[PDB]
Symmetry: C3
């Protein structure tokens, strides 16, 4: 395990996701409100899935070698397995907060699936120049998602409770900033142009992942917006 310099960040990531999972699990024990239960379920599952995939990367299972540029390049494929399930759960948290219509939710989840799926294909593609074609398609799917979060959701939040409108606005802003960093790190890291070494890349993704999951969850689950308006 320690044979890879990036192991320290995989281990820290595993620990922080594990701790985040346990914290949300305990916190949600005292919850009976049916609406709050939905948000706790979604939000606890996110770091639990990430915990398993960080562990698989730490132990070496979630790593494969991909030939491109005349080299055997270490590619952590387990990231995409994580993201396939956790990024639509994160979007679902946002969509339920603002009572999004079903068509909009399906558009978001579908675009998200395309985003992660094409990122996976790009990560595993052996023809170097083609990796960036997949990156571009994935990034276009991301831009669609960000567009919807701003010009379909923000003006939906404003007709809702003030506490859900303010909580949505904060989580929207956190999401757009954090999620936009992922394609940049991929592009300059070992999957793309290879300018930033894998150990630093792994650190960067770990900070983004913990912030986008445990950070996000801490903000959401401390808000009164997750509860039905009750006396």
């Amino acid at each position: 395990i320690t044979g890879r310099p990036e192991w320290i960040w995989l281990a820290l990531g595993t620990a922080l996701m594990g701790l985040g999972t346990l914290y949300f699990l305990v916190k949600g024990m005292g919850v009976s409100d049916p609406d709050a239960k939905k948000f706790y379920a979604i939000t606890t599952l996110v770091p639990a899935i990430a915990f398993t995939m960080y562990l698989s990367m730490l132990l070496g299972y979630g790593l494969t070698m991909v030939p491109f540029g005349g080299e055997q390049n270490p590619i952590y494929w387990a990231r995409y397995a994580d993201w396939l399930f956790t990024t639509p759960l994160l979007l679902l948290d946002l969509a339920l907060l603002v009572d999004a219509d079903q068509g909009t939710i399906l558009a978001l989840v579908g675009a998200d699936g395309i985003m992660i799926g094409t990122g996976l294909v790009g990560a595993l593609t052996k023809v170097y120049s083609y990796r960036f074609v997949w990156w571009a398609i994935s990034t276009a799917a991301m831009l669609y998602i960000l567009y919807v979060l701003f010009f379909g959701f923000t003006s939906k939040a404003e007709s809702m409770r003030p506490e859900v409108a303010s909580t949505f606005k904060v989580l929207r802003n956190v999401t757009v900033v954090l999620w936009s960093a992922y394609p940049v790190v991929w592009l300059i890291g070992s999957e793309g142009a290879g300018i930033v070494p894998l150990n630093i890349e792994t650190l960067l993704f770990m900070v983004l992942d913990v912030s986008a999951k445990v950070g996000f969850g801490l903000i959401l689950l401390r808000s009164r917006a997750i509860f039905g308006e009750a006396e």
Copy 2:
């Protein structure tokens, strides 16, 4: 890319799915009705997914070699990845049109999953005679789906709005004819008996795919059946 004679049909397929995706995306921009949004979301996602998988076939990612009959046989596995997601979306379009009950929808999607999954296993099976066992099981799942579309849905459409009944009937008929061709092409093509060469097989699937997705979508999204009855 041009090293494979079937590349021209993969390229045309990619282009037509891409163009179809953009057309539906633009067309649905001016839509606020919650019901119509569902149909636009579902129907736009279908060629978008197909676009990505056609591209993966064009670039060579979605192709593998399978030993059977003492030969290395080129198998485009990306078709099944496409179909796994797009065929239940197509069925969902039909089921929502007639306000199908939840049990019926689950039966359809489940049978569809079995249909595509067993087709994939058959496509990748190395014992030649066993490929046709999987083809038979998949075809039985197809026949179940077609049965339900006729003797569970058609008489559901007739108690609904005339515009939804007439639109459903047309899309049902398009679906049954087009979908029934797929097992025949598989059986006589490079996956099955090998009587029709891969380049012609690829052409045939491209015509079926564009018709079943973009053709289907053009009929559906031009109907007033996708809108709630409103003043």
Copy 3:
């Protein structure tokens, strides 16, 4: 096929799932009640999926070799493909019976996904001692599911119809006993410590699978709890 001593149990399993599938399919033909249709759909799909995966194991497709302990160890990976889809369907049968809230259903299905997914990783892991780390995480996800079935569902059933409360209690008890055997068989069988040989392991899983699917389904589909209260 007969080259593997466990083939007889794979063949019997295939037959019993096939027969169970046909029986439930015929039985549900005379059903119009929308609630009952849901239970028939879910419950018929379960042995149908299991039939396909038992067949893939019989024909040899669903088997791979995994190096650990200095040996090539036969691992039937198709079990996890089965279980990935059938165990959440089984939980859905239980959850719908007691009209579980959406948050609880998502927690169950999510924990179940983690349970099966980590079992799959453990089954395919090449470092022997690490296989048991994945077994432990999977078992913890199982224990969560069993906890919810007892201390979240049982007291939900009691405020419902007596026929649904009594049917739920029986199916809950069947589920907890049968499902708890699976991690034990894995641990002592060819995936784990290797004390029980593969042919006996295969027998054990076949008895558990038929009981947990066809047995379970026979109890559920003969109950009046699956019908809406109607005059």
